[PDB]
Design an enzyme around this catalytic site. Structure first.
Site, mmCIF file in Angstrom:
data_model
loop_
_atom_site.group_PDB
_atom_site.id
_atom_site.type_symbol
_atom_site.label_atom_id
_atom_site.label_comp_id
_atom_site.label_asym_id
_atom_site.label_seq_id
_atom_site.Cartn_x
_atom_site.Cartn_y
_atom_site.Cartn_z
ATOM 1 C CD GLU A 1 -2.647 1.289 -0.156
ATOM 2 O OE1 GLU A 1 -3.152 0.299 -0.727
ATOM 3 O OE2 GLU A 1 -2.680 2.435 -0.648
ATOM 4 C CG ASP A 2 -0.520 4.571 -1.041
ATOM 5 O OD1 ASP A 2 -0.770 4.317 -2.238
ATOM 6 O OD2 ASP A 2 -1.375 5.021 -0.251
ATOM 7 C CB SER A 3 5.271 0.756 -0.044
ATOM 8 O OG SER A 3 4.598 1.100 1.151
ATOM 9 N NE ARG B 1 -4.715 5.945 -4.214
ATOM 10 C CZ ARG B 1 -3.512 5.946 -3.655
ATOM 11 N NH1 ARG B 1 -2.590 6.833 -3.991
ATOM 12 N NH2 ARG B 1 -3.229 5.035 -2.728
#
Ligand SMILES: [Mg+2]
Ligand SMILES: [Zn+2]
Ligand SMILES: [Zn+2]
Ligand SMILES: [Zn+2]
Lengths: 248, 48, 192, 67, 117, 144, 124, 259, 46
Positions: free
Chosen positions: A174-176, G48
């Site tokens: 996650e977002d890494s 997104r």
RNA sequence: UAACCGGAGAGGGAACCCACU
């Protein structure tokens, strides 16, 4: 004062007023000294504020709307210069906002202030608080035309990078992101941080008088236990001295 | 005043009695790691 | 551990090839939106020449906006149904949404087929200017493009007007999130 | 401020190629063809020889206050 | 601030040795050899040679953590046959093979500067 | 002095922790009571907190610069009661909607979905690579 | 030095912390010698809707192989993904920008094709 | 149960890069061959930078970084030298190190571009790669300020740093027509051909092989110019021999300790 | 014992004793700088 | 005809603004 306006083209007939002669002088600028104010004097374009924008009709594209086709209204009075000019300073460096989502565009435009890079040209002279500067600034590979108007070609922030859209190891749920140790060793995104200190010594009516001096263990009292060898005789650290926290 | 000093959010009743400063409490950013079990957390050497 | 290692062996990506569709279904989308647009122009002309019979319980204006909303909702639903029928079953979008990890079947529809009509305060975008949503349009027009319906997809790109409308929607969502978090914090403190 | 000596991905030598790149752009070749003439096949080196900005000319345009 | 110095990846310090051994209890004739401060560039080829061996029933290699320079190998071979001599035999076979690659590569490169033509 | 460094039984030592010790760990705001869990501490070289996605899922944690707080109890009975009440297996499941809250994160979820797809045919070398990472493995290879 | 745990930014808003760092032998690689730098999240992309990021990466690869600075003006409507795929086919690479990657640990090819290419990142 | 008979042939050789093909060996062995090219090949690189006086606008740490990232010539004196960390001597000794000097005073009105040519070396067998074209730029110096420094170069490998990584780029691949079907092509016609592909223009896809192994590995080794590629391969194989020998001796002693 | 200082805009060297006005000897310039330390510096190339 | 002494707690605060969650 206080009214906000933007330049817009003036069109009277179905045809516009921005002629090839004028764009020829504008292309041969810096010789004839043909100016934007000279264009305003020519009356091709004019400033349009909010109430006047309310009461006027606009032509979105001369090549598409002012051209003769199935007519929409055929009563066009003003024309926009370029639609991308509705964007701002950060939205200008935002690429493909017509493809991006609006929350993403807002987030990226907010993060543009956090976008770290070479902030000023004379940062070695300009001694400020909490400065940041990268080793290897680079212009972006793909951008809008407005960036070199915002001087982004000369003082950019960041490096063009070879990314891999994939899920390789699983340390990036996650977002890494995962990165090259060898490239980071080779100079990839290595930056340096500047922090500035200050001190104003004061002279008073002999009750308490402050003077820059190297403190002495036997003479001075109230000292905190640390080293003082790096301190010079006057009480200043010379440049080029390695020092860590909890030190004078 | 003292009435302000207690009715404030930083007041004695709330900012000093209901919620007060405590030691023995680190704070830092985190990083995903799947190679350890769900019950374990890895911490930096300086924190430890 | 073992699913991470199997994913390491397998590999999983997302790409333009996954996000792109075929021309026959593209033509289906253009035909559908053209039919919907000419239909709503017919309804607008009906209201102009006053053949519109008002529904009991609401005014003629409310009946007309209900008709417009019904037509646009039906067109957008048909567009999404056509796309999700034609997602070609090798799309990683489809695979991951079937796994239920993230995203939604409508999110495939905005990213691939069409953005659709965006609503502010539960209705169409009002006439902020003098009876016009923008000076780029004429006075007193009720077209879906001029009122806030997006005829394009994310892959196709957006005109600046519908980009402004998507900005309207995003700002509305963000202000809702901020006031939601603040008020639910105060309410939870009150309950505690 | 300076050209990196090596490709971040590859490690090919880059430092001389910047001044060579400036020489070829003064000799008025299209920059992609001049890049290929210098012999940078991979795009991960083409990027750094293409879109490098130099600041040290401005920094040296500033006077040395520490003499 | 807490960066590991680079030699932590390869330098073996005092107090620890390169190879440790543990006998498994889940299945008999199974042994765990732990190699310290070394990675998949040997792990993969040792398991390749072990898969080349048919006398082993189960083979396995895994790093306990990527940032912890260490690997463990669990091998369960056929009874009457020992995993220790199996592991040494696999390694020395790999050694002889790579040596053969080395002299073949010298004769090939020498053929190249004398000219294939 | 080493006379001071000499020790006897019953003294108090402010010692650095090692692996196995119980710590509590949270994110403000504590919206749900699942947002602060007990955990066992372990040491890794690089300087940040390392944790699991199954713990991020109740934490509302998503690694975009969000930092966590970490408290350690000093008293042994407080440590024991934290260990035996606020621990993640002991509170897998919430009371408010009688549902599990640990879950499975998105990447492993999509990966296990493609793994549990019907047509998966896995090579012997890959199955060999896979069946070390089962902690509760019996140690016997299954029939292909 | 850029350690793990620093915050890195795209030009589209995908905030990302540096998880771990592997060696150059450990990262995957293409048929040629190109090795990547960043491994962003193909689960983050659909949430997104960063099709702008996808087009940005593909246009960046096209402009890098072409030898020119790409232009990404929003309301141009004169260039599109079809023309970009045409330029990709002109330069010989795949039409949709996917390529074959090779494992750094095992050496076997990745079963799926993998997207790759340059863009512009910023640390924060 | 025993090793097969692999084969080696080389297509072409050039100073910068070489191309060769290996057959009848494991993909694990070939991957380790690429990794042993990348990682543990020992070369000579600048490591210890002492700076007497810097007045350039570039900072001292940056100067040290670029000096460490300068490549050098390491034909056989790298094999002669011993590791600095292991050689028992006060500081660095010439058996385990190489001495460098760099003194530049820009006294001319024009900017004096400090180059790799200006590094004075202590041993003739080691120089910057560029000398024996445009030199490698180090720092552009304005008139008036100077830079005086001493340096020591030692022997290391890519497990330490990419500056001790000498391989500019490895291209290692196999099966140019996916006959082993390691990848699945949804659009194989849209997939471009490889340069080693022999499939038809209409097909562009070899048929699936039910029984086979990945084979016929193609290698393109691009050096950074510090060493000849053949010498790089020989050094990598020699280091692999040494490492396996050490592992054998240590694990034999482990078995002796167990029994 | 006295400090060796650099004027800046003069780029000149001067000697300064403590508790003295911070002025250049030929121009009296208030912006004023100190020289690099004489203590040795090394950097490993990492 | 003289003999082993050792020393570490900290000092404001209050407001505004920005940033992040
Ligand atoms: Mg968050
Ligand atoms: Zn490169
Ligand atoms: Zn020595
Ligand atoms: Zn002066």
């Amino acid at each position: 004062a206080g009214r906000i306006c933007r330049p817009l083209l003036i069109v009277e007939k179905q045809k516009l007023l921005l002629k090839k002669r004028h764009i020829d002088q504008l292309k041969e600028r810096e010789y004839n000294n043909y100016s934007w104010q000279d264009l305003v004097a020519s009356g091709v374009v004019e400033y349009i504020d909010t109430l006047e924008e309310e009461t006027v009709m606009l032509a979105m594209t001369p090549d598409d709307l002012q051209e003769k086709e199935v007519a929409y209204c055929s009563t066009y009075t003003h024309c926009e210069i370029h639609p991308s000019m509705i964007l701002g300073v950060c939205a200008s460096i935002i690429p493909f906002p017509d493809h991006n989502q609006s929350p993403r565009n807002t987030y990226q435009s907010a993060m543009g202030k956090q976008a770290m890079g070479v902030y000023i040209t004379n940062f070695h002279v300009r001694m400020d608080t909490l400065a940041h500067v990268l080793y290897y600034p680079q212009k972006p590979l793909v951008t809008t035309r407005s960036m070199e108007y915002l001087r982004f070609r000369e003082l950019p922030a960041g490096i063009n990078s070879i990314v891999a859209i994939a899920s390789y190891t699983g340390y990036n749920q996650e977002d890494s992101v995962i990165m090259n140790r060898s490239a980071v060793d080779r100079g990839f995104f290595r930056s340096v941080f500047y922090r500035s200190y200050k001190e104003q010594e004061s002279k008073k009516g002999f009750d308490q008088e402050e003077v820059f001096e190297k403190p002495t263990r036997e003479t001075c009292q109230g000292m905190r236990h640390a080293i003082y060898d790096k301190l010079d005789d006057d009480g200043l650290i010379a440049p080029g001295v390695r020092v860590s926290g909890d030190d004078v | 005043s003292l009435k302000q000093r207690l009715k404030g959010k930083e007041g004695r009743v709330r900012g000093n009695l209901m919620g007060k400063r405590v030691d023995f409490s680190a704070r830092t950013v985190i990083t995903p790691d799947p190679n350890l079990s769900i019950d374990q957390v890895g911490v930096p050497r300086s924190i430890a | 551990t073992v699913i991470n290692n199997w994913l390491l062996i397998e590999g999983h990506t997302i790409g333009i090839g996954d996000s792109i569709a075929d021309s026959k279904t593209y033509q289906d989308i253009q035909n559908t939106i053209k039919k919907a647009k000419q239909d709503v122009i017919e309804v607008i002309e009906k209201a102009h020449n006053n053949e519109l019979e008002p529904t009991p319980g609401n005014t003629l204006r409310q009946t007309f906006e209900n008709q417009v909303n019904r037509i646009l909702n039906d067109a957008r639903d048909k567009t999404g149904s056509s796309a999700q029928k034609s997602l070609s079953e090798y799309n990683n979008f489809k695979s991951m949404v079937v796994s239920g990890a993230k995203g939604s079947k409508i999110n495939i529809s905005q990213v691939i087929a069409v953005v659709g009509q965006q609503n502010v305060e539960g209705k169409r975008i009002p006439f902020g200017f003098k009876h016009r949503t923008l000076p780029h349009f004429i006075k007193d027009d009720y077209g879906p493009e001029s009122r806030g319906f997006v005829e394009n997809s994310y892959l196709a790109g957006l005109t600046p007007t519908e980009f402004f409308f998507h900005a309207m929607g995003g700002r509305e969502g963000l202000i809702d999130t901020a006031v939601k978090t603040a008020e639910t914090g105060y309410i939870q403190r009150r309950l505690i | 401020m300076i050209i990196p000596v090596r490709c971040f991905t590859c490690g090919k030598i880059v430092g001389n190629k910047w001044e060579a790149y400036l020489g070829l752009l003064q000799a008025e070749y299209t920059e992609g063809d001049a890049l290929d003439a210098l012999g940078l096949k991979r795009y991960c080196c083409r990027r750094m020889l293409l879109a490098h900005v130099d600041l040290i000319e401005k920094l040296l345009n500033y006077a040395p206050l520490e003499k | 601030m807490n960066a590991p110095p680079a030699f932590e990846s390869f330098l073996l310090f005092e107090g620890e040795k390169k190879i440790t051994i543990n006998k498994d209890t889940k299945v008999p004739n199974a042994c765990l050899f732990t190699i310290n401060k070394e990675d998949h560039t040997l792990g993969n080829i040792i398991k390749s040679q072990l898969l080349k061996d048919p006398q082993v029933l189960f083979a396995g290699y895994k790093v306990p953590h990527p940032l912890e320079h260490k690997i463990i190998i669990r091998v369960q071979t056929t009874p009457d046959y020992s995993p220790q001599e199996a592991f040494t035999n696999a390694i020395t076979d790999l050694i002889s093979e790579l040596s053969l690659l080395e002299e073949r590569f010298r004769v090939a490169i020498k053929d190249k500067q004398e000219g294939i033509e | 002095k080493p006379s001071d460094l000499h020790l006897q039984t019953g003294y108090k030592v402010e010692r650095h922790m090692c692996d196995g010790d119980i710590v509590i760990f949270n994110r403000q705001p504590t919206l749900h009571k699942m947002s602060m869990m007990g955990h066992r501490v372990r040491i890794l070289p690089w300087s940040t907190f390392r944790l699991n996605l199954s713990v991020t899922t109740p934490y509302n944690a998503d690694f975009d610069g969000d930092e966590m707080n970490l408290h350690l109890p000093q008293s042994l009975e407080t440590r024991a009661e934290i260990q035996e009440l606020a621990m993640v297996p002991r509170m897998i499941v919430t009371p408010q909607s009688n549902r599990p809250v640990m879950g499975i994160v998105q990447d492993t979820l999509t990966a296990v979905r493609k793994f549990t797809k019907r047509d998966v045919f896995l090579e012997r070398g890959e199955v060999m690579n896979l069946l070390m990472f089962l902690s509760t493995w019996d140690g016997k290879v299954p029939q292909p | 030095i850029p350690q793990i745990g620093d915050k890195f930014a795209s030009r589209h808003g995908q905030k990302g912390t540096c998880g771990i760092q592997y060696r150059q032998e450990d990262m995957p690689f293409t048929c040629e010698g190109i090795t990547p730098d960043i491994i962003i999240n193909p689960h983050a992309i659909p949430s997104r809707m960063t099709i702008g990021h996808l087009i940005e990466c593909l246009q960046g690869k096209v402009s890098a192989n072409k030898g020119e600075i790409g232009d990404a003006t929003p309301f141009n409507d004169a260039v599109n993904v079809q023309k970009i795929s045409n330029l990709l086919s002109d330069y010989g690479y795949h039409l949709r920008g996917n390529e074959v990657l090779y494992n750094g640990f095992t050496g076997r090819k990745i079963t799926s094709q993998i997207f790759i290419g340059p863009t512009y990142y910023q640390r924060l | 149960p025993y090793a097969n008979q692999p084969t080696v042939r080389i297509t072409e050789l050039t100073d910068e890069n070489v191309k060769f093909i290996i057959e009848n060996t494991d993909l694990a062995v070939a991957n380790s061959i690429r990794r042993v090219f990348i990682a543990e090949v020992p070369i000579i690189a600048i490591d210890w930078v002492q700076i007497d006086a810097n007045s350039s606008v570039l900072h001292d740490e940056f100067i040290a970084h670029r000096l460490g990232l300068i490549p050098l010539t390491s034909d056989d004196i790298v094999d002669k030298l011993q590791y600095s960390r292991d050689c028992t001597c006060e500081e660095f000794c010439p058996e385990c190190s190489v001495e460098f000097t760099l003194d530049v005073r820009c006294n001319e009105d024009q900017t004096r571009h400090v180059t790799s040519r200006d590094l004075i070396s202590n041993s003739p067998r080691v120089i910057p790669v560029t000398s024996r074209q445009d030199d490698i730029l180090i720092v552009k110096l304005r008139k008036g300020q100077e830079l005086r420094l001493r340096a020591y170069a030692k022997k290391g490998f890519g497990k330490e740093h990419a500056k001790w990584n000498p391989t500019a780029g490895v291209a290692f691949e196999y099966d140019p027509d996916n006959a082993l079907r390691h990848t699945v092509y949804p659009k194989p016609e849209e997939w471009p051909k490889s340069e080693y592909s022999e499939l038809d223009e209409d097909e562009s896809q070899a048929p699936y092989d039910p029984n086979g192994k990945p084979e016929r590995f193609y290698y393109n080794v691009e050096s950074c110019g510090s060493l000849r590629p053949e010498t790089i391969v020989l050094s990598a194989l020699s280091g692999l021999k040494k490492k396996l020998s050490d592992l054998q001796t240590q694990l034999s002693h482990e078995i002796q300790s167990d029994v | 014992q006295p400090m060796i200082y650099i004027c800046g805009e003069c780029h000149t060297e001067n000697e300064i004793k403590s508790r003295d006005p911070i002025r250049c000897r030929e121009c009296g310039y208030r912006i004023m700088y100190k020289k690099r330390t004489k203590r040795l510096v090394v950097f490993d190339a990492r």
